[PDB]
Curated annotation (Swiss-Prot), chain E:
Membrane topology classification: Single-pass membrane protein
Functional summary from the UniProt entry: May help in the organization of the PsaE and PsaF subunits.
InterPro entries: PSI_PsaJ, PSI_PsaJ_sf
GO terms classed as biological process: photosynthesis
A GO cellular component entry from the record: photosystem I
Transmembrane segments: 7-27
Name by which UniProt lists this protein: Photosystem I reaction center subunit IX
Keyword entries, A-Z: Chloroplast, Membrane, Photosynthesis, Photosystem I, Plastid, Thylakoid, Transmembrane, Transmembrane helix
The organism's taxonomic lineage, starting at the top: Eukaryota, Viridiplantae, Chlorophyta, core chlorophytes, Chlorophyceae
Length: 229, 203, 212, 217, 39
């Protein structure tokens, strides 16, 4: 079995049934199956969120450059009332999330379109609605799920590294890429900072301070500033 | 079992025998059967009264905003002549409302006891007593042709709805000092800046 | 056979190695009595966890101080924050009192009666206030991640590490108290100082600790 | 069962058919003052008396004082209302005092004799027609006839409910009176105003800020 | 240890400690509240 370590031994509760495992849980927290399903769900959740996020940020930096995706929160504009937008947002989200959670806590219990009785989703797996939720399927879930989880974990890493690269350079990830390409040698946190018993150094942040939006003036500190190297 | 919460856990006692029962009692306050009766009746009364109340609110407002004895705001209590002093008429009322109250209650405690005109013994209600649903003279248009249940369900539904309606009326009136139709027209002009938080934060 | 706190001598009677951190160290036989011993177990656990809290907050704040983040020195921090804010010292204190009193009383009467606190007399919760062991209230709340309910072996190892780091944190916070009591400075400052000159930055250089 | 303190042990005499069958028991007897049956019975009666009196008093304080915040019903402060009334009155305060002493004394003596013997004032012919309804209702502290006119003592369902609510609200009314007089000593202000102030700023309107309750601060 | 506990539960030492406790109580009382005459 392909393992996250060549030549090592998987733990107890890890075998390989669920895709995306290769015997990795050094803390062995996958003991309780309840929390384990909980965490499978949560990891799928985060992976999908982050995949969507990186995709959107990338394509947007592409087509509409010079718009700091990080500062889109600030510099967005729309004639619609922001309060109404966030209201619709909250309510929509409360609904969808309570649906998914009610189904998790009680499997196969909400599978119907409660409006159109004709419409009702077939039986499926928690974390795998499908049917209408997956109408067209080329290939096999055997590979689809493994690719899903792989790409999702990778995209989580992508998103967080984008955030770091912004906090350190303020540049969009593509800008930072072109920068790295320009100087392969000097474009490294290595070439940016280091720590020694004599003295320590860290790169300064580009996210300036409390952002002054339309009256609120959001306090904008840094992520764990003092321990960046 | 239509539930206020699909897949949830209904209480045992709630069994749909009353219209509008979606198994809703998160506080288990209807475990006593006598209490359940008391409160079925109270829901009915307060809800139906809220119905007729919000109707008496809306209708004359709608007529005033169109092309007529008065166009006064519904909460403008002490202000009208009505050719008679309020206190006297109020005493009249309390007596007569007490009259439903007493025979309503009598038939609730002892069913099938109040059917006749006590004056005109011939003039009498049938056996379809159903404490809370007399009918007969209370159903002169040949209704109750349907079973009872569609009308009962829509009844309890609209009654709860009207209770909420009146609550909104009084609350938003205390806050805005305005009339409900006007408030709704404002929300229609713009909903995007007419919200609770809009106005409580302007407050 | 287990490594004694003092190699060569045999351990005491009421000390065997059943609980984590047992190296046979009760030269004063305070745990001769089972009830008192178990009580002491719980007390040591509580105090060690508190010391862990103390060390963590201290070191974080001290880093925030030394690096230019404007974080006050801990022994000044309480005063400076109550001053920077419009808070009322007695109000803070009394609310904190309320809270610690209620929770600690629950713990106390659970030590008294081992399981009466999970009876569900509380709002609606049951066994979520049921102690797994003395000083080990492992439940859905005090162990939502459920480490105790898997691999009891690694769990015992974790208990070992817990008491270990706990005694370490106790001695650490005492050390910090001493560093300030001596130098009047930040412990991280004194740290960088000993870094500068271990040969000439120490208690022997303080001359206060050793009064010669 | 519902205990004043979970985990803790229940007082034996409190854990008895009579006591647990009296009302509102929670095992609350730290000092153990009702071990004697006669004693605890007396105390039950006493708690009843105090409950009802305190309910009445707090009503007479709040409701008039509440509606004096409303436009109508200009009434003074409760503690000064004594002076106000003796001013607006006609008979001397000592006089009306002695009168009401007579009045209360007679019926209190009645209650007394009945507690001594439940079938005491049912002594036929002692009064013209009293005895008939002047007998107890098998629960000392629960007379009948004129007592419970509307006949709410007949339905056993709501019986213990009325009882529990009675004892609850009565104890709470005691506490209300105590808080009122306490904040009258400390703040010196009317309780409604004290409430208004604590509403305006609980964070600074409290005995914590009075420097009265806790002067060492 | 239990021997020690018993030795402490012996009588004259208990009389001792109770008296010490009471006396320190009253001495501190007079310290913080000097010169009491009435009330
Ligand atoms: C003809 C005599 C008579 C009159 C004029 C009233 C009049 C009144 N009762 Mg009563 N009642 C009377 C006899 C009776 N009532 C009822 C059953 C009810 C009900 C079910 C209700 C009333 C209520 C009322 C009020 C609204 C009437 C209504 O049902 O709509 C009204 C002031 C309402 C009420 O209770 O409001 C609190 C209501 O909904 N009455 C019974 C038992 C069948 C009666 C028997 O004689
Ligand atoms: C994590 C997901 C996420 C989040 C939080 C946002 C957030 C935002 N997007 Mg969106 N966006 C996303 C995914 C996301 N986007 C995806 C998946 C796409 C692909 C369709 C886009 C493509 C996109 C574009 C092309 C634009 C936005 C814009 C914006 C900003 C204004 C609305 C807002 C901050 C608008 C913007 O830049 O506003 C300033 C805008 O023009 N987004
Ligand atoms: C997930 C993949 C990923 C990839 C491919 C990259 C790639 C890169 N990162 Mg890194 N980075 C990532 C995630 C990633 N990062 C994450 C998760 C973190 C958190 C520790 C960071 C935090 C980070 C910082 C703070 C910096 C980089 C920088 C860089 C660039 C220079 C190499 C270096 O110093 O590192 C390079 C393009 C450096 C850069 O921007 O160089 C121009 C730089 O300063 N990265
Ligand atoms: C909160 C204070 C406290 C309490 C109540 C206890 C309680 C106990 N300690 Mg001690 N102990 C403490 C702090 C405390 N310890 C600290 C801070 C240290 C570090 C110096 C130690 C180091 C220590 C050792 C090394 C041992 C004990 C042991 C014991 C047990 C018997 C003596 C008993 C449960 C013995 C034992 O069985 O521990 C489990 C034992 O071998 N303790
Ligand atoms: C609402 C105000 C606010 C703001 C603007 C910031 C801003 C910041 N915090 Mg945070 N922080 C806040 C509230 C806030 N914090 C609260 C309520 C908590 C409790 C969870 C913390 C706990 C906290 C810690 C523990 C640390 C920071 C740190 C920092 C600074 C370095 C990154 C950053 C500027 C870091 C720092 O520099 O600390 C000195 C750091 O280590 N914060
Ligand atoms: C490095 C220190 C350390 C370690 C190794 C442990 C280890 C343990 N703790 Mg935790 N714990 C610690 C510090 C530590 N604790 C501190 C500082 C606190 C204070 C918040 C607590 C308070 C605490 C409680 C109150 C409980 C645990 C519990 C546990 C057990 C299950 C959770 C787990 O494995 O982690 C395990 C023996 C649970 C337990 O005992 O389960 C049986 C439990 O109920 N711990
Ligand atoms: C002067 C009034 C008074 C008197 C005579 C009694 C008398 C009694 N109380 Mg107490 N009690 C009182 C006020 C009084 N209570 C108040 C003000 C409170 C509120 C804190 C309580 C709360 C209270 C509880 C919660 C309980 C008692 C109980 C009792 C009984 C045994 C002790 C006894 C009948 C115990 C009992 O067994 O009641 C039946 C019991 O559980 N009392
Ligand atoms: C049982 C307690 C109690 C007590 C001791 C008093 C005491 C007093 N009341 Mg009464 N009062 C009470 C309950 C009580 N009231 C209740 C329950 C009500 C509500 C109906 C009132 C309503 C009331 C009014 C409206 C007035 C009094 C007045 C008085 C005063 C003359 C008697 C005196 C301060 C008179 C007063 O205060 O005159 C200045 C007065 O006018 N009371
Ligand atoms: C019966 C219930 C009850 C209620 C609802 C309140 C409510 C209140 N009391 Mg308290 N109080 C009560 C009983 C009650 N009290 C009793 C029985 C006592 C006697 C010890 C007091 C004595 C007391 C004092 C001396 C003070 C309050 C005060 C207050 C108010 C501020 C909070 C505070 O300091 O509390 C405590 C608050 C509205 C404060 C106040 O008046 O704020 C306006 C205040 O200074 N109370």
């Amino acid at each position: 079995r392909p393992l996250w370590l060549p030549g090592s031994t998987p733990p107890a509760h890890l075998k390989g049934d669920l895709p995306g495992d290769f015997g990795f849980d050094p803390l062995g927290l996958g003991a309780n199956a309840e929390s384990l399903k909980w965490f499978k769900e949560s990891e799928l959740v985060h992976s999908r969120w982050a995949m969507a996020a990186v995709a959107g940020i990338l394509v947007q930096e592409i087509v509409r450059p010079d718009v700091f995706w990080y500062n889109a929160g600030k510099e967005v504009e729309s004639p619609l009332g922001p309060l109404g937008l966030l209201a619709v947002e909250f309510f929509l989200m409360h609904w969808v999330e309570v649906r998914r959670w009610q189904d998790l806590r009680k499997p196969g219990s909400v599978d119907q379109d409660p409006i159109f009785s004709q419409y009702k989703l077939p039986p499926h797996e928690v974390g795998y609605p499908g049917g209408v939720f997956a109408p067209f399927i080329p290939g096999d879930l055997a590979e689809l799920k493994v690719k899903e989880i792989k790409n999702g974990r990778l995209a989580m890493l992508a998103f967080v590294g984008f955030v770091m690269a912004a906090q350190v350079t303020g540049k969009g990830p593509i800008a930072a890429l072109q920068e790295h390409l320009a100087d392969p040698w000097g474009t490294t946190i290595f070439s940016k900072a280091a720590v020694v018993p004599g003295q320590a150094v860290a790169p300064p942040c580009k996210i300036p301070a409390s952002v002054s939006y339309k009256g609120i003036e959001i306090p904008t500190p840094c992520f764990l500033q003092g321990l960046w190297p | 079992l239509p539930s206020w919460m699909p897949g949830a856990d209904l209480p045992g006692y709630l069994n749909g025998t009353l219209p509008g029962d979606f198994g809703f009692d998160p506080l288990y306050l209807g475990q006593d059967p006598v209490k359940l009766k008391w409160y079925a009746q109270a829901e009915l009364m307060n809800a139906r009264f809220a119905m007729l109340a919000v109707a008496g609110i809306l209708v004359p407002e709608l007529l005033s905003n169109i092309g007529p004895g008065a166009g006064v705001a519904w909460y403008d209590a002490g202000k009208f002549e009505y050719f008679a002093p309020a206190s006297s008429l109020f005493g009249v009322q309390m007596l007569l409302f007490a009259w439903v109250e007493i025979r309503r209650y009598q038939d609730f405690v002892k069913p099938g006891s109040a059917n006749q005109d006590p004056i005109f013994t011939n003039n009498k209600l049938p056996d379809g007593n159903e404490p809370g649903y007399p009918g007969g003279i209370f159903d002169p248009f040949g209704w109750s042709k349907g079973d009872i249940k569609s009308l009962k369900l829509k009844e309890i539904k609209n009654g709860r709805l009207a209770m909420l309606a009146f609550a909104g009326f009084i609350g938003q009136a205390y806050t805005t000092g305005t009339t409900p139709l006007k408030n709704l027209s404002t929300h229609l002009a713009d909903p995007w800046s007419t919200t609770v938080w809009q106005n409580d934060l302007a407050r | 056979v287990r490594p004694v706190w003092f190699p060569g001598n045999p351990p005491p009677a009421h000390l065997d190695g059943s609980l984590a951190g047992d190296y046979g160290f009760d030269p004063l036989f305070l745990g001769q009595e089972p009830q008192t011993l178990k009580w002491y177990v719980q007390a040591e656990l509580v105090h060690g966890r508190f010391a862990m809290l103390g060390a963590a907050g201290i070191i974080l704040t001290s880093i925030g101080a030394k690096v230019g983040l404007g974080f006050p020195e801990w022994y000044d921090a309480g005063k400076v924050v109550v001053e920077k804010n419009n808070i009322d010292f007695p109000t803070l204190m009394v609310i904190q009192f309320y809270l610690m009193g209620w929770a600690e009383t629950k713990r106390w009467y659970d030590f008294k009666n081992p399981g009466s606190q999970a009876d569900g007399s509380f709002l609606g919760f049951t066994e979520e206030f049921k102690g797994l062991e003395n000083g080990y209230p492992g439940g859905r709340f005090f162990d939502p991640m459920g480490l105790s309910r898997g691999d009891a072996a690694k769990y015992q190892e974790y208990k070992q590490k817990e008491v270990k780091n706990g005694r370490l944190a106790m001695i650490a916070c005492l050390g910090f108290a001493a560093q300030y009591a001596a130098t009047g400075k930040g412990p991280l400052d004194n740290l960088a100082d000993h870094l500068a000159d271990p040969n000439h930055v120490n208690f022997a250089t303080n001359g206060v600790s050793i009064p010669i | 069962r519902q205990s004043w303190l979970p985990g803790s042990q229940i007082p034996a005499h409190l854990d008895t058919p009579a006591a647990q069958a009296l009302a509102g028991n929670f095992g609350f007897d730290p000092l153990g003052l009702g071990k004697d049956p006669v004693a605890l019975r007396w105390y039950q009666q006493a708690e009843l008396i105090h409950c009802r009196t305190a309910m009445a008093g707090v009503a007479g304080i709040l409701i008039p004082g509440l509606l004096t915040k409303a436009g109508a019903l200009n009434v003074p402060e409760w503690y000064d209302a004594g002076k106000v009334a003796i001013e607006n009155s006609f008979a001397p305060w000592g006089s009306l005092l002695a009168v009401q002493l007579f009045l209360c004394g007679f019926v209190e003596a009645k209650r007394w004799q009945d507690i001594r013997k439940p079938g005491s004032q049912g002594e036929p012919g002692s009064f013209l027609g009293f005895e008939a309804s002047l007998k107890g209702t098998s629960e000392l502290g629960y007379p009948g006839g004129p007592f419970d006119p509307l006949g709410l003592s007949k339905e056993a369902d709501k019986w213990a409910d009325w009882k529990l609510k009675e004892v609850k609200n009565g104890r709470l009314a005691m506490l209300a009176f105590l808080g009122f007089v306490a904040q009258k000593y400390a703040t010196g202000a009317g309780p409604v105003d004290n409430l208004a102030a604590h509403l305006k700023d609980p964070w600074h309107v409290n005995y914590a800020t009075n420097g009265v309750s806790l002067p060492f601060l | 240890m239990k021997d020690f506990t018993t030795y402490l539960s012996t009588a004259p030492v208990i009389a001792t400690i109770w008296f010490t406790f009471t006396a320190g109580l009253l001495i501190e009382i007079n310290r913080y509240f000097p010169d009491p005459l009435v009330f």
